PDB file of all heavy atoms in Angstrom:
ATOM      1  N   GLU A  20     203.776 163.332 -62.864  1.00  0.00           N
ATOM      2  CA  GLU A  20     204.501 162.486 -61.904  1.00  0.00           C
ATOM      3  C   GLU A  20     205.385 161.535 -62.698  1.00  0.00           C
ATOM      4  O   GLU A  20     204.958 160.986 -63.733  1.00  0.00           O
ATOM      5  CB  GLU A  20     203.465 161.731 -61.051  1.00  0.00           C
ATOM      6  CG  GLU A  20     204.115 160.655 -60.121  1.00  0.00           C
ATOM      7  CD  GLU A  20     203.103 160.129 -59.176  1.00  0.00           C
ATOM      8  OE1 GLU A  20     202.849 160.805 -58.136  1.00  0.00           O
ATOM      9  OE2 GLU A  20     202.533 159.053 -59.492  1.00  0.00           O
ATOM     10  N   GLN A  54     187.936 170.351 -73.831  1.00  0.00           N
ATOM     11  CA  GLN A  54     186.980 169.354 -73.449  1.00  0.00           C
ATOM     12  C   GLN A  54     187.479 168.547 -72.261  1.00  0.00           C
ATOM     13  O   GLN A  54     186.666 167.946 -71.543  1.00  0.00           O
ATOM     14  CB  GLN A  54     186.713 168.379 -74.624  1.00  0.00           C
ATOM     15  CG  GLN A  54     185.910 168.991 -75.804  1.00  0.00           C
ATOM     16  CD  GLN A  54     184.657 169.653 -75.302  1.00  0.00           C
ATOM     17  OE1 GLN A  54     184.520 170.891 -75.331  1.00  0.00           O
ATOM     18  NE2 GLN A  54     183.736 168.833 -74.772  1.00  0.00           N
ATOM     19  N   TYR A  56     189.602 168.351 -68.659  1.00  0.00           N
ATOM     20  CA  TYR A  56     190.219 169.188 -67.611  1.00  0.00           C
ATOM     21  C   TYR A  56     190.324 170.673 -67.981  1.00  0.00           C
ATOM     22  O   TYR A  56     191.298 171.368 -67.637  1.00  0.00           O
ATOM     23  CB  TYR A  56     191.615 168.622 -67.285  1.00  0.00           C
ATOM     24  CG  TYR A  56     191.577 167.378 -66.439  1.00  0.00           C
ATOM     25  CD1 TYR A  56     192.038 166.135 -66.943  1.00  0.00           C
ATOM     26  CD2 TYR A  56     191.268 167.449 -65.056  1.00  0.00           C
ATOM     27  CE1 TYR A  56     192.019 164.990 -66.191  1.00  0.00           C
ATOM     28  CE2 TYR A  56     191.223 166.263 -64.315  1.00  0.00           C
ATOM     29  CZ  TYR A  56     191.650 165.086 -64.836  1.00  0.00           C
ATOM     30  OH  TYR A  56     191.660 163.938 -64.021  1.00  0.00           O
ATOM     31  N   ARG A 411     211.277 165.565 -39.594  1.00  0.00           N
ATOM     32  CA  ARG A 411     212.002 164.264 -39.640  1.00  0.00           C
ATOM     33  C   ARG A 411     213.467 164.456 -39.917  1.00  0.00           C
ATOM     34  O   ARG A 411     214.270 163.790 -39.308  1.00  0.00           O
ATOM     35  CB  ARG A 411     211.404 163.341 -40.736  1.00  0.00           C
ATOM     36  CG  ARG A 411     209.974 162.947 -40.426  1.00  0.00           C
ATOM     37  CD  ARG A 411     209.434 161.860 -41.529  1.00  0.00           C
ATOM     38  NE  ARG A 411     207.985 161.995 -41.624  1.00  0.00           N
ATOM     39  CZ  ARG A 411     207.316 162.645 -42.552  1.00  0.00           C
ATOM     40  NH1 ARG A 411     207.928 163.164 -43.634  1.00  0.00           N
ATOM     41  NH2 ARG A 411     205.985 162.700 -42.414  1.00  0.00           N
ATOM     42  N   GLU A 414     215.108 165.621 -36.682  1.00  0.00           N
ATOM     43  CA  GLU A 414     215.208 164.496 -35.771  1.00  0.00           C
ATOM     44  C   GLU A 414     216.375 163.580 -36.172  1.00  0.00           C
ATOM     45  O   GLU A 414     217.168 163.116 -35.301  1.00  0.00           O
ATOM     46  CB  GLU A 414     213.853 163.753 -35.807  1.00  0.00           C
ATOM     47  CG  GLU A 414     213.757 162.588 -34.825  1.00  0.00           C
ATOM     48  CD  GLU A 414     212.489 161.742 -35.108  1.00  0.00           C
ATOM     49  OE1 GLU A 414     211.369 162.241 -34.898  1.00  0.00           O
ATOM     50  OE2 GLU A 414     212.682 160.631 -35.629  1.00  0.00           O
TER      51      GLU A 414
ATOM     52  N   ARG B   8     206.535 159.654 -33.605  1.00  0.00           N
ATOM     53  CA  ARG B   8     206.672 161.081 -33.434  1.00  0.00           C
ATOM     54  C   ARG B   8     205.349 161.834 -33.669  1.00  0.00           C
ATOM     55  O   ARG B   8     204.404 161.264 -34.180  1.00  0.00           O
ATOM     56  CB  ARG B   8     207.749 161.632 -34.405  1.00  0.00           C
ATOM     57  CG  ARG B   8     207.240 161.571 -35.887  1.00  0.00           C
ATOM     58  CD  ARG B   8     208.204 162.141 -36.937  1.00  0.00           C
ATOM     59  NE  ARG B   8     209.427 161.399 -36.872  1.00  0.00           N
ATOM     60  CZ  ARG B   8     209.619 160.236 -37.481  1.00  0.00           C
ATOM     61  NH1 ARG B   8     208.710 159.764 -38.338  1.00  0.00           N
ATOM     62  NH2 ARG B   8     210.748 159.518 -37.239  1.00  0.00           N
ATOM     63  N   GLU B  20     202.594 159.691 -35.887  1.00  0.00           N
ATOM     64  CA  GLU B  20     203.163 159.002 -37.021  1.00  0.00           C
ATOM     65  C   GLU B  20     204.087 157.936 -36.435  1.00  0.00           C
ATOM     66  O   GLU B  20     204.793 158.209 -35.418  1.00  0.00           O
ATOM     67  CB  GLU B  20     203.920 160.026 -37.910  1.00  0.00           C
ATOM     68  CG  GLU B  20     204.875 159.351 -38.928  1.00  0.00           C
ATOM     69  CD  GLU B  20     205.435 160.435 -39.844  1.00  0.00           C
ATOM     70  OE1 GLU B  20     204.702 160.764 -40.836  1.00  0.00           O
ATOM     71  OE2 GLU B  20     206.599 160.874 -39.601  1.00  0.00           O
ATOM     72  N   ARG B 182     188.642 162.466 -63.546  1.00  0.00           N
ATOM     73  CA  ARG B 182     188.450 163.577 -64.507  1.00  0.00           C
ATOM     74  C   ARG B 182     187.003 164.165 -64.353  1.00  0.00           C
ATOM     75  O   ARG B 182     186.814 165.367 -64.300  1.00  0.00           O
ATOM     76  CB  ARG B 182     188.730 163.115 -65.922  1.00  0.00           C
ATOM     77  CG  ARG B 182     188.422 164.120 -67.019  1.00  0.00           C
ATOM     78  CD  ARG B 182     188.333 163.362 -68.474  1.00  0.00           C
ATOM     79  NE  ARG B 182     187.524 164.306 -69.252  1.00  0.00           N
ATOM     80  CZ  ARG B 182     187.390 164.290 -70.578  1.00  0.00           C
ATOM     81  NH1 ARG B 182     187.943 163.320 -71.317  1.00  0.00           N
ATOM     82  NH2 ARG B 182     186.710 165.262 -71.173  1.00  0.00           N
ATOM     83  N   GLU B 186     186.396 167.947 -63.130  1.00  0.00           N
ATOM     84  CA  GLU B 186     185.685 168.888 -64.048  1.00  0.00           C
ATOM     85  C   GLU B 186     184.433 169.478 -63.420  1.00  0.00           C
ATOM     86  O   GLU B 186     184.248 170.684 -63.490  1.00  0.00           O
ATOM     87  CB  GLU B 186     185.368 168.256 -65.396  1.00  0.00           C
ATOM     88  CG  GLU B 186     186.634 168.019 -66.257  1.00  0.00           C
ATOM     89  CD  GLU B 186     186.310 167.364 -67.606  1.00  0.00           C
ATOM     90  OE1 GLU B 186     185.125 167.207 -67.903  1.00  0.00           O
ATOM     91  OE2 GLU B 186     187.252 166.978 -68.349  1.00  0.00           O
ATOM     92  N   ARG B 411     197.145 155.070 -59.381  1.00  0.00           N
ATOM     93  CA  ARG B 411     198.313 154.225 -59.590  1.00  0.00           C
ATOM     94  C   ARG B 411     197.941 152.737 -59.460  1.00  0.00           C
ATOM     95  O   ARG B 411     198.416 151.888 -60.263  1.00  0.00           O
ATOM     96  CB  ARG B 411     199.384 154.557 -58.545  1.00  0.00           C
ATOM     97  CG  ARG B 411     199.915 156.040 -58.592  1.00  0.00           C
ATOM     98  CD  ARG B 411     201.132 156.135 -57.749  1.00  0.00           C
ATOM     99  NE  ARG B 411     201.378 157.542 -57.507  1.00  0.00           N
ATOM    100  CZ  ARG B 411     200.913 158.236 -56.448  1.00  0.00           C
ATOM    101  NH1 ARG B 411     200.438 157.607 -55.330  1.00  0.00           N
ATOM    102  NH2 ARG B 411     201.096 159.572 -56.426  1.00  0.00           N
TER     103      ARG B 411
END
Side-chain angles (χ1 to χ4, degrees):
Chain A
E20 172 171 278
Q54 289 309 111
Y56 284 115
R411 295 185 207 100
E414 184 191 292
Chain B
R8 70 178 60 83
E20 165 174 276
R182 174 197 158 165
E186 290 179 6
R411 299 192 196 92

